[model samples]
Target: GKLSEQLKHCNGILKELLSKKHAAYAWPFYKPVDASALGLHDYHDIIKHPMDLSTVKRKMENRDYRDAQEFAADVRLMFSNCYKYNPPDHDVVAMARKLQDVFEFRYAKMPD
Candidate 1:
């Protein structure tokens, strides 16, 4: 029940964040520890960037696998660096790790 509730909350935050035109700034709203608490020193400093999944999806749809791969690479790097410092709670970490695995399995091999 707790995990369900936490996932619901996480999804709610994700929806809100993704709905925005500039989702990167909404990273704080999602409370991504790596993006908000670790990478961004100041709240305002975390400006929106063109790294959303939708953008990647569009690139891939356009047959721009190179761009898609590049975007995935950048995101993977950020995710890795964030995990190094902002290790999530156990349950959250497990879910994220699973999703990461799936994303990797679908996109490419897992990062080092």
Candidate 2:
């Protein structure tokens, strides 16, 4: 009963995060990067471990995270990777920054 309730809480948080798909900046983060197709060959070299919201969603569906923090960590990782590979003035970089703040604020409100 306790673990199931925790799972429900974690899922609720993820749902709220994913529901931001309507945000204009949210488009670049919905899926993983296509390094070759996009012609950004060095994307992998700069970002050793790429991440994305879709991957987070899949992991949640598969119960891959040990806890809610772990789930939130991956979400942050996705944005950090964008920051690492894109310049400070890049559109995706700015969008990622906006979403990162949103995530951190929500994460801070999580129950311990």
Candidate 3:
């Protein structure tokens, strides 16, 4: 549902912008990132600096879905690709649920 809402917002913005005759600049797309390609040592640094998840969470809470979707997608991809190298000892499902809670809380107040 969040993704759908985000896509709607994105399309709406593009439509409004296009109607103003500046549509050529609107490039909506999604690109997948590969964390494993960055090497294990660089992963944490990337997350802390360029990929600050907390700031992303706050942005999502404010209905900043574009950035939120990017963050969520990157996190999921990173964990999927690197989990085998640094697998958690506990329940992975529970961990994912916790992370989802953070995302939900950030965007929960958004209206329909």
Computed on alpha carbons, the lDDT of every model, listed in order, comes to: 0.43, 0.79, 0.42
Give one digit per residue, the lDDT tens place, for model 3 in 1-112.
7666765554443233324343232111112224567355665544443322343344445666564356456445434433443446535434444444444454444335
Query: Best lDDT goes to which candidate?
Result: 2
| TM-score: model 3 vs. ground truth | 0.27
Model 2: runs farther than 4 Å from truth? 1-7, 20-22
What tens-digit string does per-residue lDDT give for candidate 1 at 10-74? Answer: 33332433455434333332333444554456423443342434544444456454433454564
Stronger candidate by TM-score (1 vs 3): 1
Considering every candidate listed, which one attains the maximal TM-score?
2
lDDT of 3 at 102: 42
- Stretches of candidate 3 exceeding 4 Å from the true structure: 1-4, 7-53, 61-71, 75-78, 81-85, 88-94, 97-112
Ranking by lDDT: 2, 1, 3
Q: lDDT per residue, candidate 2, 1-112, as tens digits?
A: 6556555676776676667563676778888999999999999889988998889889989989877767777888898888788889988888888777877776676664
